[PDB]
Every structure is written in C-alpha cells, then in structure tokens.
From a paper:
We present a 2.2 Å resolution structure of human mitoribosome together with validated mitoribosomal RNA (rRNA) modifications, including aminoacylated CP-tRNAVal. To produce a 2.2 Å overall resolution map of the mitoribosome, we collected five separate cryo-EM datasets. A final set of 509,691 particles yielded a 2.2 Å map. The improved resolution allowed building the most complete available model of the mitoribosome, including several key protein extensions involved in tRNA binding. On the rRNA level, the quality of the map allowed the modeling of 13 rRNA modifications, of which 6 are mitochondria specific compared to E. coli. The mitochondria specific modifications include base methylations m5U1076, m5C1488 in the SSU; m1A2617 in the LSU; and m1A9, m2G10 and ψ39 in the tRNAVal incorporated in the central protuberance (CP)41–43. The density further revealed that the tRNAVal incorporated in the CP is amino acylated. A notable feature of the cryo-EM map is the presence of continuous tubular densities associated with rRNA that we assigned as polyamines, justified by the electrostatic and hydrogen-bonding interactions at the amine groups. Thus, in addition to a previously assigned spermine (SPM), we detected one triamine spermidine (SPD) in the SSU, and a diamine putrescine (PUT) and three SPDs in the LSU. Recently, another putative binding site has been proposed, formed with residues 173, 177, 208, 209, 210, 238, 242, 245, 291, 292, 29545,46, and our map at the local resolution of 2.65 Å suggests the presence of GDP in that site.
The mitoribosome translates mitochondrial mRNAs and regulates energy conversion that is a signature of aerobic life forms. The human mitoribosome translates at least 13 respiratory chain protein-coding mRNAs from the mitochondrial genome. It consists of three rRNAs and at least 82 mitoribosomal proteins, 36 of which have no corresponding homologs in bacterial and cytosolic ribosomes. The mitochondrial rRNA is reduced compared to its bacterial counterpart (2512 vs 4568 nucleotides in Escherichia coli), tRNAVal has been incorporated as an additional constituent, and protein components are extended (~18,075 vs 7536 residues in E. coli).
Author numbering:
A (entry chain X): 87 to 245
B (entry chain D): 61 to 298
Write the structure that this text describes.
RNA sequence: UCCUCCGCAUAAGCCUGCGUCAGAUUAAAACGAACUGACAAUUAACAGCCCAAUAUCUACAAUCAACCAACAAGUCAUUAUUACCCUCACUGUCAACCCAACACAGGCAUGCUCAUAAGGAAAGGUUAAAAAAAGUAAAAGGAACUCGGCAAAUCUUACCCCGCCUGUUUACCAAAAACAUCACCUCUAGCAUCACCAGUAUUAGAGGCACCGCCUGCCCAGUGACACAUGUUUAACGGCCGCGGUACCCUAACCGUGCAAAGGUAGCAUAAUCACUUGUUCCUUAAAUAGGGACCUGUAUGAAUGGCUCCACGAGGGUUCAGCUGUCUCUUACUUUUAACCAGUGAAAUUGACCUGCCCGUGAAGAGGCGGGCAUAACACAGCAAGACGAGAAGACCCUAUGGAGCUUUAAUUUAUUAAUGCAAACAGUACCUAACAAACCCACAGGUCCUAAACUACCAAACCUGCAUUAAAAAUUUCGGUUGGGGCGAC
RNA sequence: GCUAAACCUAGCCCCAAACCCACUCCACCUUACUACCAGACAACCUUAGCCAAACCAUUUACCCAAAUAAAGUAUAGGCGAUAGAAAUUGAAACCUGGCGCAAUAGAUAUAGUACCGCAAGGGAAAGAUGAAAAAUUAUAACCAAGCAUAAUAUAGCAAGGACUAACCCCUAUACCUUCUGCAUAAUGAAUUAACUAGAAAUAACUUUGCAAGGAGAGCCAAAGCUAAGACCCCCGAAACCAGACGAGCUACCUAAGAACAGCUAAAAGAGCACACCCGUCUAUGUAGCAAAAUAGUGGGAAGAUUUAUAGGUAGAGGCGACAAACCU
RNA sequence: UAGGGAAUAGUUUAAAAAACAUCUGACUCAUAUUCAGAAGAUGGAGGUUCAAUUCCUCCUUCCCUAACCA
C-alpha cells in the first residue's frame, strides 16, 4: 500500500497504488506428515521451496518472520512434534522408511516440551496454559483428614 | 438491508404462490431498476418449462390432457393446466390449445419426420423443416428459455450433423443439438401486441411507475442504425 | 338563557397529571385547584403473552354470489404416521391525558351516535368617540370602480391563446402554458437461481415526443454513434443561400453568375415568436395601445428538441352579451369586535446623553442642537403620521477580495478506479513435408548411371488471477490577470 | 427606606511520588437491566483536509524511546515555501511542594445532573450567622445602577465664567471609530457590576564580570567573551476534510390493513355532493391562536385516491410524474 | 457611438485567368443556338520597393456585430 507519481514525475499528481502478488493454487506433499496440502502460494514460495530441497526443509528452516503464515507455523509445529516424539504413526507398517525420514531431518529436532509451543499466538498460548492449570478444587474434607492423621502420629511419638 | 427473496419454495406445486414485489430495489435496498412499483397483487403459478418430464416411475413418450387454459398475471402468454397419470402441472398454452385436447410429450427421433400437431413437444430432430416452434431450450434437458412470450414463434430452418438451426423471434439464427425439445405452434394470445393501455392509470395497475421528468438531450446513440443481423449463435461444441 | 364545532369508546402516545385530608403555595384575573405534603387507587371474562416432529396436500376470486359481464387475476382449506393425561400463571386496566417551548383557534387512526340521553359558555364592570375589524340594510343609477368586476351580489352568453384529457410540482411568496400521461418513434439486449425475473424479443431496459385527425419535407459535408472495403445513421447533435438584370412604377414566370451537405418544403403567421409595432383592413365601443376575422417576406415562423386542425376538459391567461350588485357616482344607518373609563394581572422591539420649538442662512453638500431672527409659565389625557435621513435585518442591487460554493465544458492536471484490448506471467501438448521425365547408356521387369539426391521445423494452452502498457468510460483536484472618471464592452 | 451590598470556604490547577485493575443476594446483548430450548454472522485493509507557499497544481514541522553537544551542519526541496539527519558526545535524578485559583476565578461539575435534541450530541445555574439555634425579637451601621424620602416653571450637549441669588446674563456644534474632511441625518453604545486584547529571535544598545582571551567540555574570539535588562494583541466568516448520528418530518418503495353517505348514469383515472384529501382567490393575522394560522370562497372526493401500523434506501449518498423538489 | 470585413472588364467569379454581356464575321429564308474573331479591369489618395491586385496608411460607399447591469 503506497503512492506513486503519475508518469514517474514528482511534479505530477500523487496517486494511490496497491501492488498485489500473483497467487497460485498448488499441491504440496510433506514427507514428515505424509499428507498432501492444497496451498495458495506465490512464485517466490516455489523458488524458496526449490532452494530448500522440499517443503519440509522450507518449513523447518524458515524463521517465523520470513514464513509470514500462521498455517506455515502450524505445519512447523506438526513436523517438529513428530520429530520430537519420533512418532510411529508415520508409515506405521514401514519402520525402516519412517527412520530414514526422521534421519533426513534430524538437525531440526527439538525437545517435545518446546515443540508444543512453536507457532502459537499469545491468545492460543494463554488458552493452552489455562487448560493445563484448570483443575477442580480439592474438597477440604480430604485435606483435613490429612492434617489430623499426620498430627495424631506426631502425638504418639511424644507419648 | 433485510431483503429476502420470495423465491424460497423448493417443491413444485400448482397452487398459486404468494409473491413479493421488489419496487426495482436490489438486496441492498437501493433502487437498481427504475420504473417499477405498486400494481395489483399477484400470485405466482409455477410453470413447468421441461415439457418432457416423465413421471417418477415412468419413462418414454407420454400424453397429457388439457384441463383448463386461463389468464396468467405474471406473463403475457396464457397457461394451460395439463394432467397425465397422477400428475398435474402448469405449461404455456399454444394459440389453439383448449380444454379437452390431448398433447404428446415424446423424446423420440425417428428416421422419418413426424406430422407436427400444434401443442405437441418433440425433439427438433424429429420435426419437419419449416415447422413453427416455441419454448425452445438451448441444450438438451435445460428447459425452455426462448420463444415464451405471447404470440411468439420460431421456425426450424436446417438440420445438419445432428444439430438444428432455428430462427429466433428477433430473426437471429440459433444452432442447437437435434435432441433439444421444442413445442409446435405459436404461443397463445396472438393479439397481445394490439392491446391499448388507454390511460395512465392502467400502467400503474401493471406495476409501472411514471418516467422521470428530467429532460435528456439525445446523443450519438440515437438515430436509426442499420446493422447486419448478428452471426448465428451456436450452443453446440465441436 | 344560549352553544353543540361535538360526544362515548378503542388503538397509539403519555405515566398519577382537578380522588380524600392537610396546607393559602396559585389559574396569564380570582379564596376552585391542574401547585405542595401525606393517604388512597386500576382486581379478568376484554386485551396481550401461543402451537411436537417428518413427509404430504392446497387449478376453479371478491362483489347479498344468485342471474349478468369482466380484468388490474385476487385475504382465509390438508392428509399420513409418530409423540402427547394438564390445566386457568404472568402482564395492560387511573386521569381533565398525546405531537406542537404554553391549560396553543394547529396536528391526530378506527367504531358508534347524525344531533344528541353525551359535551359545553361568545359578555370582569361600564361607556357607546375617532381610526380599525366582522356583519346587516340602502333612494336614483347599475362597472361610470379598477391593472382586472378584486370583493360583494346575482348566478348567465359567446369566443380566443396554451395544454389533449384525470393526474403531478416549488411543505413556508409561483398550481401554471411547467412535469407526467394514453399514443407514436429511436436505441440496447439471445438470457436463468438475490434487482431486471422465478421474466425470455407480442419480452426487458435506456430515451425522445405527447391521445386522436391531416402530416412529419431537404441534408450524413462537420460533430457523435455505429461499421469496416468503400461506408451507414437525423423521430441522433444539428443545418436547410447569395449578387445583378428583365413586363411604366411594386413584383419578376424569366436571364446571367458564384457558393453549398442541403439551400426552409407543406403548413401557419404582427403569433406567448428581437425590434420596426399601437403594421394594414373588417367586426366590436359614443370613443379601444384590448378582443375577434383576414392581409402578411416570419430576411429572427416552420414540421416527434414536432407542424397544422379539431371533440372533451381547466380554481391556467385574454375578450364579451345579459343580469347582478355599496366596486363606483357618494356615502349613510345599526349590531358585534376593538375601542375609551374602573378593577386585577402584566410583555416586546427600542434607548449616547437630552433642559427634545418655527423661519431663513450655513455646514461631510436635506439642522430641535451652528449664524441671524421669531416664538416661549408648568404638567396630563385622546387623535394624527409631515420629520426625528423613525424601528427591524453588519444591502440580497452594484463594485472590490490573488474570499467561497453550485453548475457546464473542445480550462489545466490525472487515470489511482471501472471496462475493453495488447504483452508478460501462469498453464497442456499436437504435428515435423512431395512437382520427376533417359539427350546418351544400362536394365527381362520395375527402374537405374550421367548433368546435384543439399540445407531447413512448424504450429502452439480457453478462462480466472497478478504485473506493465494502450484506448475509453465515469470522475477527481484546481483556476478563471490587471489598468479603467463604477463594472462590463472597446482599448491598453 | 427599599432593592441590594459584603464574606471564605467547597473544591480545583500545576508538579513530585507511585504502575494500573473489582467483588452481598438478584437482573442485564431479546424491546439491556427480561429465571428456563436446535444453533452455527464474526476482528485487521496507506488518514484526509484546513493551512503555508501571499493563487495553486509537486511540496508544507507533528513524542516514538538519553538531557546536552555535534547542528539548524551534511542533506532534501515548484533547489520555492520550507524540511532536516547521523557518526560521535555524554549529565543529573532526596514524593508529601507552590511569588497557583478562591464561587463570572479554579475542573463543565453542587453535575455530565436539570434542561435541550429522534439520535449522535449539546449542556447549565448556585453557597455564605454564631462557641452554642436544646441561644431566632438574631448578626447594628454606612456603599452600584434602579427607585423612595422629594414631579414640574420661558432658553436649548445642560456645563463653564460667575453672582447677594438655583435659574435668568455671557461663552460653548456629546463621545468613540472612520475619513481628504463628521454637530453630522456615517459606526457603536439603556445603565450598573464583574470579566474582556502585545507572546519571541536576529543583531544592536545599556550596565556588571574577566580579558587576548571569555564561558561550569560543545561555542565564539584580529577586544573579545560571559551574564542581565529591554520590542512583536483580541473577537468574527462563507468554507474544506475525517468519523459518527439521522427516513417517528418528508421523497420513493416493501409487508400486511382501513375508509369512501346521498343523487345521476349505471359503463366510467364519469358529473353533482358529505366524510375525507388538497390549498384557487380575498380579507384578517404579521413577537400571530399559528417559526405558514383563521373566516369565507374554492380543486378532488371508486382512484395515478386518501390513510393507521412495522420495515427499506444516508450525505463523494439517498429519493425525485426535474420544482435543482425532499432527506427532523 | 464602438469594432471586424469587403471593393477586379458593363455583369458575376478566379490567382491579371475564364464565363457570358458587348462589338466582327461565318453558317440560316431570317432570328436564336452553334462555329471562328475582337476588344475591353485591379473604389480613391499617399508612401516603401527596380517592380505592389499581391507590404502599409487615411478617406468614401456598403455589409456584419455590439450598444449592457442596478
Ligand atoms: K397476462
Ligand atoms: K400521562
Ligand atoms: K394554530
Ligand atoms: K390547479
Ligand atoms: K456523419
Ligand atoms: K392579433
Ligand atoms: K386586427
Ligand atoms: K387550471
Ligand atoms: K411621523
Ligand atoms: K464617474
Ligand atoms: K486562496
Ligand atoms: K461552569
Ligand atoms: K465605534
Ligand atoms: K449630514
Ligand atoms: K456623514
Ligand atoms: K447607515
Ligand atoms: K423506515
Ligand atoms: Mg409481470
Ligand atoms: Mg416513456
Ligand atoms: Mg420528458
Ligand atoms: Mg381471553
Ligand atoms: Mg379507561
Ligand atoms: Mg393529514
Ligand atoms: Mg349536557
Ligand atoms: Mg366567556
Ligand atoms: Mg373575550
Ligand atoms: Mg371588556
Ligand atoms: Mg342602492
Ligand atoms: Mg372603466
Ligand atoms: Mg356588463
Ligand atoms: Mg377610471
Ligand atoms: Mg369574485
Ligand atoms: Mg393540463
Ligand atoms: Mg410555495
Ligand atoms: Mg405539495
Ligand atoms: Mg400557492
Ligand atoms: Mg409537457
Ligand atoms: Mg400525436
Ligand atoms: Mg424532420
Ligand atoms: Mg424596370
Ligand atoms: Mg414557404
Ligand atoms: Mg416581435
Ligand atoms: Mg377594459
Ligand atoms: Mg428558427
Ligand atoms: Mg423552434
Ligand atoms: Mg432534433
Ligand atoms: Mg377526451
Ligand atoms: Mg376556461
Ligand atoms: Mg386538474
Ligand atoms: Mg389605543
Ligand atoms: Mg388597567
Ligand atoms: Mg441603534
Ligand atoms: Mg437647512
Ligand atoms: Mg400624545
Ligand atoms: Mg438628531
Ligand atoms: Mg432607518
Ligand atoms: Mg454590509
Ligand atoms: Mg481556499
Ligand atoms: Mg492566470
Ligand atoms: Mg478590475
Ligand atoms: Mg468605464
Ligand atoms: Mg476586452
Ligand atoms: Mg495558499
Ligand atoms: Mg481564491
Ligand atoms: Mg546520535
Ligand atoms: Mg465555576
Ligand atoms: Mg444608589
Ligand atoms: Mg443662552
Ligand atoms: Mg467619504
Ligand atoms: Mg465641524
Ligand atoms: Mg450619529
Ligand atoms: Mg460604514
Ligand atoms: Mg516580546
Ligand atoms: Mg482544497
Ligand atoms: Mg466526507
Ligand atoms: Mg417512514
Ligand atoms: Mg404492497
Ligand atoms: Mg359514494
Ligand atoms: Mg371522478
Ligand atoms: Mg367531481
Ligand atoms: Mg410524488
Ligand atoms: Mg426545470
Ligand atoms: Mg431553475
């Protein structure tokens, strides 16, 4: 979103101008996820994927500020979680193939605890934390039965 | 705005349906077409434009009996209630269609051309060249979209390579597949274009609002223009 | 005694807003109270607040609905199976009331009453001047009034212009000849699931003109539009001629010559038509710049931005017969209101200060206020409108401001936007090219040797989207110099 | 002698410091403040313009993360108006204070209430005893305009010179603004009280300090340099742009309603004529009963009629039988 | 009163030419038509230039336009 001078002459009118990228709908295959996705992409995206030698490398290598896509960040978390867990659901009946794929991308592996939070927005992260911390309150009946028993045992020792 | 089209009914019926006027407004509530408003209230009678619609469990050519021919407020041509088997439906009446007549809805194209009776529905391939037709469809099974107005008729000009060339009321030729079904004869109400409105009020009854009083200078668009008939419109894909 | 314009109810609105008691607060006057404090109140049967599912059904108006005849073609209808044992909750209910700053001559839907069974009071008291308002009556005359018969009275004749007609418009200075309109014509469009339209060229939309009747002549050079090979198109924008001579004079059937796309045709004409103009003549009046009929070169009439007739219609504009009348000659009388006086209550514009005369002269050029004269105890009430360049609105006319805004456009600037087209971008593949000839010789043929038998690929992916261009459409932003015996025009 | 006058508090302003943030029960996104039923709509998208350039058309400063300095320098720009860095440099930092207001001030605030507007929105006014009011026959008085006590006596900007004496005599054309020039019959002003309008650099001058140096890093300097003093108003358009709010009036439309006596003709965008709708002509009214009415007289009144209810179209727009109509 | 344009043979046009009219002849019984010949002009005055219808200036005649706002 910007402005231009008509006929590239500053002394002429200043006009609003919007440059839009050329969008293409293409199908991509993920080795780590063993699934095909119909993603709307640009020719730059195709070039970047070629330079990375595949979609999986592109998704794993590209930082968040360069991916500029929530969907891309969700794919990254999916791939990273499978690498962190060494998930057996990838090619369940072909353990050898599953282990070659995971070896190909071993450089990007990270601890599972960290991978679960990759790509999450602050709102999503807050909701995830809230669910982890949401527990029914403990009835005070149980707590008081513990102080009592613990207290009675100490009294017996003094006797 | 909260405009909802009245055209919500999903099941065919011969019961007159309550319809809502637009006033020339679109769904946004702004005037889209000028000169529309008011007029007598009207109910819509659902017209079946697919003359060859066999009953659910039936197939092949079938006949129907004309029960009544009556006025239709929603169109210039008259409409006829026809009954065949256990089904009743509204259709467009032909010039000489009257109660008690029997009409034939066939899909059969034979080596020889049939003797065309007014009001019968046949495939264009089965009709002699020069037959006056009406309620023609562009593609087979699409349903009649052409030559539906009062007194209108087309003529079957040629039949070549499984296709039919017809002349439209505007005189522009129209190529279609020979399996496209048409109705023989002219549409009812041949003297529609001779009617006289007589007074401004009668136009108001028809739902027409007066023209703007703004004077518009005429421009280059105006004045007689003698142009060649447009090239034959073709719906067949080769 | 007199009004009845109403009245009662519902709806909508309003929300305790003339019930009791206690207060002397008050109603544009007044101690009853609509104001204050307290205390009471409207009780559901009227009304509001409703409904198990799925599929399925629903051609045949209304009008006393019967004859009759229609078009603008219409407000009222189910079944099948499954599910279902229960009961009268909740809310509106008052009034002298709402929208109009007000206890406002205004606004305000429906039912019933059709003059009342309901609802109300035009006069605070007096007097009986002017001017003013609303009425009644008027001698003789009867439009002599006046821009005009406005108003009033009576209640009628004929005609003209414009518009066909009913209808529509500047809420608050214009109701019309303006707009619409039946009719006629031009232009665009071959089509479906939100307008157009649940429509399909006897249709739909964009316009012009204005029923009907007789008609609508000539022109496509220019502009526009359309179409492409020239070109087509005026019921598209628009246009539709000179100079000199010839029958005594007017005039020229006629003749010469130039120009143009065509040279205004039919009609009509002193017109609602630049002036000339109160054109000329007949009719109309005692008298007519009015009106009607004609004559008309209108050198600026004129044919769907329509011409010319003609029924019916008009709170349109004009003329007129007869009658009518206080319009007038020329005013008068009476009643009511207002008025004046008494009592109660009690505004507004306005106001430099005023101890606020007349004449002539003077003066920023029209003096109550200056000069020279004259006049002159003080103070109310009622009239009047010559002055206080009277009051009211920082003149709307006019000019000025490097002040605005609306509108138009071949003003400058621009195409971001919309549409079209081109290229790039993106996207699959289908096909790859033939004009000898022996002259001699060979070869059973079929053909060969010599005198060339090379080289050489073409097409090609429709839309959508994005980028860059081009042309349109529809718009945007901004401006519209100065001088000037006011400005403009001319000139500079 | 009345009307009045007088008052010192309520609180408020600017800083500092400190991060900030509520709760009974019940009700509240449907017509909010409404106990209790089948749904599934969902947020982001360059500010513009006034204005300055003495028009205007490119252009015209707007905290963006450290005071100072580098520096108004490099640089940008109808190279005009004006805009304007960085490298580098590098300080201090103890809330409980006031040469701030004191009822026309200070917050609009006693209150976002009353009141105004359909809505968004606009938006006030004012209080005053004393230790005790369980001391109320208390706390004296004197002061604006306006009046009253107490109308007025030839003549005149109202006074001045005077005079034994108010007047009589003589002299004298209010004020401000605006203009060549105003008693002007040119502007403003009833009067009282309160409120209500000159903001700063560049240099220079004056008076101190130190002095070829001055200055509490930067800067200037061929008597300079440092510090100080001292000069630059108020109210007013028609407009322009952005974002909201409006069709309870009115224009047109949508859904479903309602009204239209009698007579003629009996066919009617037909005639006469009520209700009803409109508003031709005249008078009245003109701060009115009324910010468009009243009386009479008129046009229409089965239709392109009139009308109640709910809904729709919104300002670069809507709507329009084009009157540049109408859109509170 | 202000402003623009125009003036060519007797007539009407052209950029010093044509057309007719005029005069001469031939053809005809004669006239016209026709054919062959002939003549004739740059409104006025002043000036530049070797040379001016063709560069300027004033006047006359005529045409067209404007002559307004309260
Ligand atoms: K019909
Ligand atoms: K109320
Ligand atoms: K009123
Ligand atoms: K009228
Ligand atoms: K043309
Ligand atoms: K005449
Ligand atoms: K005459
Ligand atoms: K009329
Ligand atoms: K007077
Ligand atoms: K003068
Ligand atoms: K300006
Ligand atoms: K205040
Ligand atoms: K003044
Ligand atoms: K004067
Ligand atoms: K003066
Ligand atoms: K004045
Ligand atoms: K509405
Ligand atoms: Mg229809
Ligand atoms: Mg029309
Ligand atoms: Mg029109
Ligand atoms: Mg009930
Ligand atoms: Mg009641
Ligand atoms: Mg009304
Ligand atoms: Mg009574
Ligand atoms: Mg009374
Ligand atoms: Mg009275
Ligand atoms: Mg009285
Ligand atoms: Mg008399
Ligand atoms: Mg007279
Ligand atoms: Mg008479
Ligand atoms: Mg007279
Ligand atoms: Mg009259
Ligand atoms: Mg008319
Ligand atoms: Mg008006
Ligand atoms: Mg009106
Ligand atoms: Mg009027
Ligand atoms: Mg008209
Ligand atoms: Mg006609
Ligand atoms: Mg014509
Ligand atoms: Mg002669
Ligand atoms: Mg003629
Ligand atoms: Mg004339
Ligand atoms: Mg007369
Ligand atoms: Mg003309
Ligand atoms: Mg004309
Ligand atoms: Mg025309
Ligand atoms: Mg008629
Ligand atoms: Mg008339
Ligand atoms: Mg009428
Ligand atoms: Mg009086
Ligand atoms: Mg009195
Ligand atoms: Mg004054
Ligand atoms: Mg004088
Ligand atoms: Mg008096
Ligand atoms: Mg005076
Ligand atoms: Mg005056
Ligand atoms: Mg003025
Ligand atoms: Mg401006
Ligand atoms: Mg200029
Ligand atoms: Mg000037
Ligand atoms: Mg002048
Ligand atoms: Mg000029
Ligand atoms: Mg400027
Ligand atoms: Mg300007
Ligand atoms: Mg820095
Ligand atoms: Mg205050
Ligand atoms: Mg005093
Ligand atoms: Mg004196
Ligand atoms: Mg002057
Ligand atoms: Mg003087
Ligand atoms: Mg004065
Ligand atoms: Mg002045
Ligand atoms: Mg200063
Ligand atoms: Mg601007
Ligand atoms: Mg805006
Ligand atoms: Mg409404
Ligand atoms: Mg409707
Ligand atoms: Mg009736
Ligand atoms: Mg009628
Ligand atoms: Mg009538
Ligand atoms: Mg209307
Ligand atoms: Mg107009
Ligand atoms: Mg106008």
């Amino acid at each position: 979103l910007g402005q231009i001078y008509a006929n590239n002459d500053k002394l002429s009118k200043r006009l609003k101008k919007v440059w839009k990228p050329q969008l293409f709908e293409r199908e991509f295959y993920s080795e780590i996820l063993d699934k095909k996705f119909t993603v709307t992409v640009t020719m730059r995206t195709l070039d970047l994927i070629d330079e990375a030698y595949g979609l999986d490398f592109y998704i794993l290598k590209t930082p968040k500020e360069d991916l500029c896509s929530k969907f891309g960040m969700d794919l990254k978390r999916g791939m990273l979680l499978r690498l962190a867990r060494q998930d057996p659901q990838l090619h369940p009946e072909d353990p050898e193939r599953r282990a070659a794929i995971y070896d190909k991308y071993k450089e990007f592996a990270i601890p599972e605890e960290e991978a679960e939070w990759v790509g999450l927005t602050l709102e999503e992260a807050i909701e995830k934390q809230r669910l982890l911390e949401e527990k029914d309150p403990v009835p005070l009946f149980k707590i008081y039965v513990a102080e009592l028993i613990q207290q009675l045992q100490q009294q017996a020792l003094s006797e | 705005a909260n405009f909802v089209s009245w055209k919500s009914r999903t099941k065919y019926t011969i019961t007159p349906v309550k319809m809502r006027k637009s006033g020339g407004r679109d769904h946004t509530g702004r005037i889209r077409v000028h000169g529309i408003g008011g007029g007598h209230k009207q109910r819509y009678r659902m017209i079946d434009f697919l003359r060859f619609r066999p009953e659910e469990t039936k197939s092949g050519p079938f006949e129907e009996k004309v029960i009544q021919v009556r006025y239709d407020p929603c169109r210039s041509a008259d409409i006829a209630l026809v009954a065949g088997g256990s089904r009743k439906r509204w259709i467009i009446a032909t010039e000489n269609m009257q109660a008690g007549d029997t009409i034939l809805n066939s899909n059969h194209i034979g080596r020889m051309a049939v003797a065309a009776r007014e009001g019968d529905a046949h495939p264009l391939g089965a009709l002699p060249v020069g037959t006056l037709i009406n309620n023609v469809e562009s593609e087979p099974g699409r349903g009649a979209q052409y030559i539906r107005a009062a007194g209108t008729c087309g003529v079957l000009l040629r039949k070549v390579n499984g296709t039919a060339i017809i002349q439209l009321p505007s005189k522009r030729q129209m190529q279609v597949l020979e399996t496209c079904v048409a109705t023989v004869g002219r549409v009812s109400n041949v003297d529609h274009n001779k009617r006289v409105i007589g007074k401004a009020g009668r136009n108001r009854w028809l739902g027409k609002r007066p023209n703007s009083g703004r004077w518009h200078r005429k421009g280059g668009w105006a004045g007689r223009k003698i142009r060649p008939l447009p090239p034959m419109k073709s719906y067949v894909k080769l």
